[PDB]
Coordinates of C-alpha atoms and ligand atoms in Angstrom, one line a residue:
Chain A
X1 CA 123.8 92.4 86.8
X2 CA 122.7 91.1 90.5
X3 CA 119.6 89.7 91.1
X4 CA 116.8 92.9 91.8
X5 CA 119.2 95.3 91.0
X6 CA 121.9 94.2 93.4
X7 CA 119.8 95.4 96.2
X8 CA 116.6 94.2 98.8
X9 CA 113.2 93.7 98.1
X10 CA 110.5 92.7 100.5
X11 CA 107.5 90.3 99.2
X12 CA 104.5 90.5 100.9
X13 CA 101.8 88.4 100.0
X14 CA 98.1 88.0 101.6
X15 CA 96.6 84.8 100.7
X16 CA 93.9 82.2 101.9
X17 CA 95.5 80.6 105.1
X18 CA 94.7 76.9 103.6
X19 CA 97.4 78.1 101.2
X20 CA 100.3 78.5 103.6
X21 CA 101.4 74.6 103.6
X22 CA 101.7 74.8 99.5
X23 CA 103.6 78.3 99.8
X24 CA 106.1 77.4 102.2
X25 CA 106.9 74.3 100.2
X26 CA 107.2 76.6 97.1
X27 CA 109.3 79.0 98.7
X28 CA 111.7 76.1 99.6
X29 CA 111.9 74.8 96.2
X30 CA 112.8 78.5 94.9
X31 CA 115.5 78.2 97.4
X32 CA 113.7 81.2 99.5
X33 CA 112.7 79.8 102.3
X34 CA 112.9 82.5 105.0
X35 CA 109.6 83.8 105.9
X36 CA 107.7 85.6 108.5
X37 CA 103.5 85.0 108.8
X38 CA 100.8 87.3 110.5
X39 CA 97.5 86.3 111.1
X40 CA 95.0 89.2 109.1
X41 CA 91.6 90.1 107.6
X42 CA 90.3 91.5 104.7
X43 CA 88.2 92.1 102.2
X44 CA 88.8 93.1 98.2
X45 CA 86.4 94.6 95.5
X46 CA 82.6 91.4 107.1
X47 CA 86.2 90.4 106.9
X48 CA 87.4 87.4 105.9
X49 CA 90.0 85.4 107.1
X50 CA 93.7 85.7 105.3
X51 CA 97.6 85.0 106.7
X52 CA 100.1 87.6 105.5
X53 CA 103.6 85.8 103.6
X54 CA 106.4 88.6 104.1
X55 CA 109.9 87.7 102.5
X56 CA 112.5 89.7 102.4
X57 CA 115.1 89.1 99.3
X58 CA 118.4 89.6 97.7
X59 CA 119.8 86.5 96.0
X60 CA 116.2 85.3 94.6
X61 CA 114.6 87.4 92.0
X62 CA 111.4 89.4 93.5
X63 CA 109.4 88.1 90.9
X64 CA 110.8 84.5 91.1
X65 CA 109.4 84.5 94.6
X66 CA 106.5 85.8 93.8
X67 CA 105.7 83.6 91.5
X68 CA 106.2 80.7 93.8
X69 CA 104.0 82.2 96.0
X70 CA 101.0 82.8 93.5
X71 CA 101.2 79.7 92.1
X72 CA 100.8 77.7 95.2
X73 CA 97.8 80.1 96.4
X74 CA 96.0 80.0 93.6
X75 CA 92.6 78.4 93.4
X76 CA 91.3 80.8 90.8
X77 CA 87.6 81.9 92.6
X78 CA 87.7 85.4 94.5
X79 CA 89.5 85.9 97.6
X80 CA 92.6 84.3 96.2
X81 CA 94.7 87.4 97.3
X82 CA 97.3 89.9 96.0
X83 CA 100.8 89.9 96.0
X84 CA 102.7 93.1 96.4
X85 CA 106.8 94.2 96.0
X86 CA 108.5 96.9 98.1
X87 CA 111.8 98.3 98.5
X88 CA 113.9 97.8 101.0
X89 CA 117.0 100.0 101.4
X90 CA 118.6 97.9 104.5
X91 CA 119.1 95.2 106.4
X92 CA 120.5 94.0 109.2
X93 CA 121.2 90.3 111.1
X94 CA 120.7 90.6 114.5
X95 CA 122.8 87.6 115.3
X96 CA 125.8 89.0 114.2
X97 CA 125.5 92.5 113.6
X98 CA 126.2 91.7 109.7
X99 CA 124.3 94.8 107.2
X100 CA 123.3 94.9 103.6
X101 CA 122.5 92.3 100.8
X102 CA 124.5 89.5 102.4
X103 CA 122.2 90.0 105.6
X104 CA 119.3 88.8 104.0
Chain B
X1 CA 122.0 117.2 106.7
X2 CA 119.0 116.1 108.3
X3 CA 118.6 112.7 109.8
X4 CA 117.5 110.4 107.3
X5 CA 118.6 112.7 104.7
X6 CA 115.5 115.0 105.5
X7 CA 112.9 111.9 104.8
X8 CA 111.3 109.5 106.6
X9 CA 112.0 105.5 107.4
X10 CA 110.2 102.5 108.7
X11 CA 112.7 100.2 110.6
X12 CA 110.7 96.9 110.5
X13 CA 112.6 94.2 113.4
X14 CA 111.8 90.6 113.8
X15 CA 112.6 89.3 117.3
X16 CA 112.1 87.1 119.5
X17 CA 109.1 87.6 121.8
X18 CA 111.5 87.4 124.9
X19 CA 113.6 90.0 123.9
X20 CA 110.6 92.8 123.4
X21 CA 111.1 94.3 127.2
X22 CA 114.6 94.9 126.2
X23 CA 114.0 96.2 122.7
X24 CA 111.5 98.7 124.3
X25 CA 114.0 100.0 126.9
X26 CA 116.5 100.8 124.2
X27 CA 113.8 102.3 121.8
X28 CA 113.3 105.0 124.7
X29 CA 116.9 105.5 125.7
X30 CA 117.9 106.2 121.5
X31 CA 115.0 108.7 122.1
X32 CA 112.4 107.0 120.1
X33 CA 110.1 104.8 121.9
X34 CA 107.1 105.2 119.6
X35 CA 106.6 101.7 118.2
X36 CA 103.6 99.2 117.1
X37 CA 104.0 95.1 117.7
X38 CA 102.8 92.2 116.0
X39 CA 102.7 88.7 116.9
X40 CA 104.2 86.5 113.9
X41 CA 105.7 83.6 113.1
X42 CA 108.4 82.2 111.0
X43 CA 111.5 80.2 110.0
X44 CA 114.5 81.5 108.6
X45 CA 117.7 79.4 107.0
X46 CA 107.1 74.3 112.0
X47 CA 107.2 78.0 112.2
X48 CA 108.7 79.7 115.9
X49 CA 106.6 82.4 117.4
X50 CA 108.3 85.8 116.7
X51 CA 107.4 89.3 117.3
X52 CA 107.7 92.2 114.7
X53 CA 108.6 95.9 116.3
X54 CA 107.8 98.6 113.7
X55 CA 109.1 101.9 114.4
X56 CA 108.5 105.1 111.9
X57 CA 111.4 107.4 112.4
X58 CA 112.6 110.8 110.9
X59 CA 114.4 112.9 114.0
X60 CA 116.8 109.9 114.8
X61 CA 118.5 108.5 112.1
X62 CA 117.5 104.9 111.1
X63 CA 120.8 103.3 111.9
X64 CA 121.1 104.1 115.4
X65 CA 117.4 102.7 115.7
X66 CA 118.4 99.5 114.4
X67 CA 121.6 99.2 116.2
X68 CA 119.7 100.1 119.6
X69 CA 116.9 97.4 118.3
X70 CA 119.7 95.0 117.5
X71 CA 122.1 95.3 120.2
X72 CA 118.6 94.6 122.8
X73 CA 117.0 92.0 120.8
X74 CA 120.9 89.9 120.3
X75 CA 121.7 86.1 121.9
X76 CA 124.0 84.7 119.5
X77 CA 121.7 81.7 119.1
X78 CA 120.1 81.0 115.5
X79 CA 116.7 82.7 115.6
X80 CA 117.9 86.3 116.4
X81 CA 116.0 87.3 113.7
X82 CA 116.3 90.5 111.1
X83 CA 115.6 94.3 111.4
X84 CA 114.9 95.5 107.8
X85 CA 115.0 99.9 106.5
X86 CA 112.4 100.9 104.5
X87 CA 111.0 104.0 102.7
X88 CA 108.0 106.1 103.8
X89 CA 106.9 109.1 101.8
X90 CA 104.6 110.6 103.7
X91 CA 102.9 110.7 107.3
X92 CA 100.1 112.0 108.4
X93 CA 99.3 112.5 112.8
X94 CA 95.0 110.9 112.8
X95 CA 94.7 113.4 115.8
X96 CA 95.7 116.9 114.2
X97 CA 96.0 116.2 110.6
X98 CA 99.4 117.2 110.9
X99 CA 101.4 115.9 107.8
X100 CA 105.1 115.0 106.9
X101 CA 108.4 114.5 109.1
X102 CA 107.1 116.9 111.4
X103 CA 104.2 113.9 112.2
X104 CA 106.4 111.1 112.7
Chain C
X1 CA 98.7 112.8 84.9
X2 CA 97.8 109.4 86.5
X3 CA 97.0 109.0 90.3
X4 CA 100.2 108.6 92.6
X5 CA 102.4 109.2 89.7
X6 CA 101.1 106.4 88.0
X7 CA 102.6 103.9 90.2
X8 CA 101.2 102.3 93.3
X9 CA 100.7 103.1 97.5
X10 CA 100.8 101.2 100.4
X11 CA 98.5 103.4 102.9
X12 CA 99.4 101.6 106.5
X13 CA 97.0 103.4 108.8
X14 CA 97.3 102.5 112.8
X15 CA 94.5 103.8 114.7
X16 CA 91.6 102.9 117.4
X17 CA 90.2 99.5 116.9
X18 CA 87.0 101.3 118.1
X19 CA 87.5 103.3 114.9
X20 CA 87.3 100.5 112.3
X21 CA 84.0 100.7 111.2
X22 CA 83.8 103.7 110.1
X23 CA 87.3 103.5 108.6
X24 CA 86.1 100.9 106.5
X25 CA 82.3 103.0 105.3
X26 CA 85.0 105.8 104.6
X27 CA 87.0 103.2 102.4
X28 CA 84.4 102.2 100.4
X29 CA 82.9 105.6 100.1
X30 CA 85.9 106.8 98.7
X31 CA 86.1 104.3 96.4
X32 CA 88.8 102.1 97.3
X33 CA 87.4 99.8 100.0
X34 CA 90.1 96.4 100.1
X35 CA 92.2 96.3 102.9
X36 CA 94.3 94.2 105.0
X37 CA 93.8 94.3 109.1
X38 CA 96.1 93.6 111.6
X39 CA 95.5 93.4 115.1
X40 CA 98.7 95.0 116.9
X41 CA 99.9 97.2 120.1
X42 CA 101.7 100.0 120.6
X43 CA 102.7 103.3 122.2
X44 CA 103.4 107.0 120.8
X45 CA 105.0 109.8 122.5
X46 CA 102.4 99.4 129.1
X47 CA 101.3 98.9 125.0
X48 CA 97.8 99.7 123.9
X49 CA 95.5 97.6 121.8
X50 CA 95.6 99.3 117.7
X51 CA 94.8 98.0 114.8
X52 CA 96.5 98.1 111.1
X53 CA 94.8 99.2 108.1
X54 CA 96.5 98.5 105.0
X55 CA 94.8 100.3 101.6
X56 CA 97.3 99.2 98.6
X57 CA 96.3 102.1 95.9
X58 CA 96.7 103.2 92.3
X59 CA 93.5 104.5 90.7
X60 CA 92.8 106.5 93.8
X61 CA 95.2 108.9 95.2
X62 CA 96.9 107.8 98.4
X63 CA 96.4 111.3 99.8
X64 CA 92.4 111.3 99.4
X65 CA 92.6 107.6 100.8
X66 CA 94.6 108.8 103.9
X67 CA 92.5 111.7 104.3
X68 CA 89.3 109.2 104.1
X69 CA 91.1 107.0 107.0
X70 CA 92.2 110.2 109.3
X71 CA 88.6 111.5 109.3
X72 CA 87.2 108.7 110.3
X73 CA 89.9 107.3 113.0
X74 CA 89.7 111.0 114.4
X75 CA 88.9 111.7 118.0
X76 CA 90.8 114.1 119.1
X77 CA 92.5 113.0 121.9
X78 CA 95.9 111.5 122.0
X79 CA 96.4 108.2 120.7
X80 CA 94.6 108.4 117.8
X81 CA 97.4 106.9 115.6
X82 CA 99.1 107.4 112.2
X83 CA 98.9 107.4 108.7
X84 CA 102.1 106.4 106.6
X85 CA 102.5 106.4 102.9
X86 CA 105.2 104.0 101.5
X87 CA 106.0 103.2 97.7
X88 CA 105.1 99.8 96.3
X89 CA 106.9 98.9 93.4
X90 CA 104.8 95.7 91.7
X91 CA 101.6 94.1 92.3
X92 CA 100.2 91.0 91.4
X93 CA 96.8 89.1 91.3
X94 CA 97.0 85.9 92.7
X95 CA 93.8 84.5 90.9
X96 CA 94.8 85.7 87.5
X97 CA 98.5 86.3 87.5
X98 CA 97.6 89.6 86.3
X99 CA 100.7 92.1 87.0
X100 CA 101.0 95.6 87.3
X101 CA 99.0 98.8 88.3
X102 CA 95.6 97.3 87.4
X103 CA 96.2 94.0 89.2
X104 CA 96.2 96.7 92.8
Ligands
AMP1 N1 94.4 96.6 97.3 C1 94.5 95.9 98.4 N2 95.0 96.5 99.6 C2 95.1 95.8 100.7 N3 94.7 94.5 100.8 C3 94.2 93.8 99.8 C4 94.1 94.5 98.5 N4 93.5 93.6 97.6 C5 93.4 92.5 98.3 N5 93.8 92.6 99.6 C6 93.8 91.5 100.6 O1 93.7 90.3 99.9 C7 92.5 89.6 100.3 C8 92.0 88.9 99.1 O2 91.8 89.8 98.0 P1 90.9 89.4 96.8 O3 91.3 88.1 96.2 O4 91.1 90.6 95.9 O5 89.5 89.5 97.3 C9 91.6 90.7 100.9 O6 90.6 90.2 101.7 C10 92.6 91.6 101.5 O7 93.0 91.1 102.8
AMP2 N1 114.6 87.1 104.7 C1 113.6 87.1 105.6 N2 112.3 87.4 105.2 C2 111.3 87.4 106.1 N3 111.4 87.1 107.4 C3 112.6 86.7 107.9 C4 113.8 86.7 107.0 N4 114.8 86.3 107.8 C5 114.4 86.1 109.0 N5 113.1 86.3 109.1 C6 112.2 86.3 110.3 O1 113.1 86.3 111.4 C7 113.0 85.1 112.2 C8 114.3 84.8 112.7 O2 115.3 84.7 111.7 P1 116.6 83.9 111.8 O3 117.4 84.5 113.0 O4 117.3 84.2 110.5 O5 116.3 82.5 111.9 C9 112.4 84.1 111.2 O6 111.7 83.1 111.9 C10 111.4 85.0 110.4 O7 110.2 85.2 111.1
AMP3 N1 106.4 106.7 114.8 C1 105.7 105.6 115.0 N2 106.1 104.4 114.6 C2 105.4 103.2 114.8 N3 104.2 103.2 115.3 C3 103.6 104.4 115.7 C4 104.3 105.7 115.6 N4 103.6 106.6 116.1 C5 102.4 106.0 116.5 N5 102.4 104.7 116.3 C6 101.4 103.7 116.6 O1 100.1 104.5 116.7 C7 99.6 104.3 118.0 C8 99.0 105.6 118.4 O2 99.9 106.7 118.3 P1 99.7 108.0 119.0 O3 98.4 108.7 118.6 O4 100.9 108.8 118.5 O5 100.0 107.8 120.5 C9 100.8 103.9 118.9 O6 100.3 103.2 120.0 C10 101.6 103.0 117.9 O7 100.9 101.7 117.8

C-alpha cells in the first residue's frame, strides 16, 4: 500500500562530483530533498575522483529517487557511477527523539 | 533473546561536528565505544558540514546505541540531524579472521 | 545456485590506509576490483586515521571478496579493522539505466 513497503530505504549513489549541482536540484523537484554528501574515490571495471549522494526515504519511492538521481548524473561515457538501494529497519530524529517512518 | 535478536546492526548517525566529543563519551559509557567518522555534508527539510558516527553493534542492542548517540548529539535547533538502523549479515575481525557476532 | 543467493553485497571493509594497495591488487585479482574509498577515523576496543573500502558484489561471492580484503589489510597487530557484510537490495547503472544484479 505505502510507498517502499510502508518502511525505510537508504539511496546511496556515487556519481562524478560535477553532477552534484543537477542532483540536488533533481532531488528537490522529486520532493526528496534531504541528503547527506561524502567526498570518495574509486574506480569500476589510480582512483578517480567521485562524491557519495546518501538519502534515506519513506514517503518517496526508492526508485523514484533513484531515478532522479541517475538522470541528472548521467553523461553516458564511463565513470558515470552506480546507484545502489539498502534497507533500513529504523530511524530516528535527533531533534526530537521522534522513531520510525515519520522520522525520515 | 539475544541483543539484536542474535544478529548484527549498523547504527549510521549524522551529527553535528560539535557534538562528536559528546557522542563519543556516551558511546563508551553504553559500553560500546568502537566507532568510525566521516566528515559530510548536507541539508535536510548550500550544504552544512556534518559528521557521520558509524557504529557496528551486536552485544548492546541497537536502540540503546541510538538513544545514547541521540540523547549526546541533541540541541533542539534544526540541523540535529538523523541516526538511521541497518542490517549487517556478517563480520569478519582483519586481525584474527575471526567471523560473525562474536567479531563485532 | 547463484553467488550470494543471487542477490547483491555491500562488502564495507575498514582497515590501515597503509594497507590499500594491496587491498586493491587483491580486488582485482579476485576478480571484482571496483570500489568506493572513504577516508575516515576511528577507534576499536584520540581517533586513528582508516580508510573505507566499499566492494558492491553479485557475480563474486561476498565471502571470497572479504577474505581477498582480510588477507591483504592483515598485520597482525591490533587495529587492523573490520569486514562487514550488509544486503543491498537494487542496483542501478547510472550510464545506461541498466537495473538489477548485472548492473553491480
Ligand atoms: N560495484 C561497485 N562497488 C563499489 N563502488 C563502485 C562499484 N561500481 C562503481 N563504483 C563506484 O562508482 C564509480 C564509477 O563507476 P563506473 O561508472 O562503473 O566506472 C567508481 O569509481 C566507484 O567509485
Ligand atoms: N533523510 C535523510 N537522508 C540523508 N541524510 C539526511 C536525512 N535527513 C537528515 N540528513 C542529514 O542530517 C543532517 C541534519 O538533518 P536535519 O536535522 O534534518 O536538518 C542533514 O544536513 C543531512 O546531512
Ligand atoms: N564495531 C565497529 N563499528 C564501527 N567501526 C569499527 C568497529 N570496529 C572497528 N571499527 C573501525 O575499525 C578500526 C580498527 O578497528 P580495530 O582493529 O578493532 O581497533 C577502528 O578504528 C574503527 O574505525
Amino acid at each position: 500500500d505505502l510507498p517502499n513497503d510502508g518502511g525505510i530505504k537508504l539511496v546511496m549513489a556515487i556519481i562524478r562530483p560535477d553532477k552534484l549541482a543537477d542532483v540536488k536540484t533533481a532531488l528537490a523537484e522529486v520532493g526528496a530533498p534531504s541528503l547527506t554528501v561524502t567526498n570518495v574515490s574509486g574506480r569500476g571495471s589510480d582512483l578517480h575522483q567521485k562524491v557519495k549522494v546518501e538519502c534515506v526515504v519513506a514517503d518517496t519511492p526508492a526508485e523514484d529517487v533513484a531515478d532522479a538521481i541517475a538522470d541528472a548524473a548521467h553523461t553516458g561515457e564511463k565513470g558515470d557511477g552506480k546507484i545502489f538501494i539498502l534497507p533500513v529497519e529504523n530511524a530516528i530524529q535527533v531533534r526530537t527523539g521522534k522513531t520510525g517512518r515519520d522520522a525520515v
